[PDB]
Amino acid sequence: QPPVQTAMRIALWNRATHGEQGALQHLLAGLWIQTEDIHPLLFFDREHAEITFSRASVQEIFLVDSAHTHRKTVSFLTRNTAISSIRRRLEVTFESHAVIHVRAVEDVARLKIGSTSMWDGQYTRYHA
């Protein structure tokens, strides 16, 4: 059997699988490292409702203006800390309690512009 906290994630996961309980987001809270060089990183700061985007020299935060769960997908509308003009849409699709797939789309000024992103790809939550 796995460690305690690990089971809690699976327990929490089960409540979101068919349970469709309020929070699937609770599984996102923490550090996520991209799969497939230097790995892009996502940290979902639950306390401050932020999402920090990192890749070496690249580091930046977007405050969550909204967040909605549907089935197995959390859809974020985030906004840059410095400039309100620059925002970012996220499509976090869970595969497992510690495995997701992210799609990101920038939104400068007010029209969303959506080619492939450096943040697009599979992520796995960090565990020691």
Residue numbers in the entry: 96 to 131, 138 to 229
According to the publication:
We also mutated Glu199 to Ala to stabilize the protein for crystallization studies. We next crystallized and determined the three dimensional structure of Tp0751_78A using selenium single wavelength anomalous dispersion (SAD) phasing to a resolution of 2.15 Å. Structural analysis revealed that the C-terminal domain of Tp0751_78A adopts a compact eight-stranded antiparallel beta-barrel with +1 topology, capped by a short 310-like helix and a longer N-terminal helix. The first ordered residue in the Tp0751_78A structure was Gln96 indicating the N-terminal residues Ser78 to Thr95 were either disordered or proteolyzed in the crystal. Analysis clearly revealed an intact N-terminal extension present in the Tp0751_78A crystals indicating that the lack of electron density for the N-terminal residues in the structure reflects disorder and not proteolysis. Comparison of the Tp0751_78A structure against the database of known structures using the DALI server revealed a striking similarity to lipocalin domains, specifically nitrophorins. Ultimately, the classification of Tp0751 as an outlier lipocalin domain, as opposed to a kernel lipocalin, is based on the observation that is does not contain all three SCRs. The SCR1 in Tp0751 localizes to the 310 helix and Strand A, centered on a GxW motif (Gly125 and Trp127 in Tp0751). Although SCR3 is distal in amino acid sequence, residing on Strand H, the key basic residue in this region (Arg226 in Tp0751) stacks on top of the SCR1 Trp and forms a hydrogen bond to the backbone carbonyl of the preceding coil. Although Loop 1 of Tp0751_78A is exposed and partially disordered in the structure, there is no discernable hydrophobic pocket, primarily because Loop 7 caps the hydrophobic core with a stacked Trp-Met pair (right).
One protein suggested to play a role in T. pallidum dissemination within the host is Tp0751 (also referred to as pallilysin). This protein is a primary target of opsonic antibodies, and thus is predicted to be surface-exposed on T. pallidum, and it binds and degrades host components encountered by T. pallidum during dissemination. The Treponema pallidum protein, Tp0751, possesses adhesive properties and has been previously reported to mediate attachment to the host extracellular matrix components laminin, fibronectin, and fibrinogen. Herein we demonstrate that Tp0751 adopts an eight-stranded beta barrel-containing lipocalin structure, and using a peptide library approach we show that the extracellular matrix component adhesive functionality of Tp0751 is localized to the lipocalin domain.
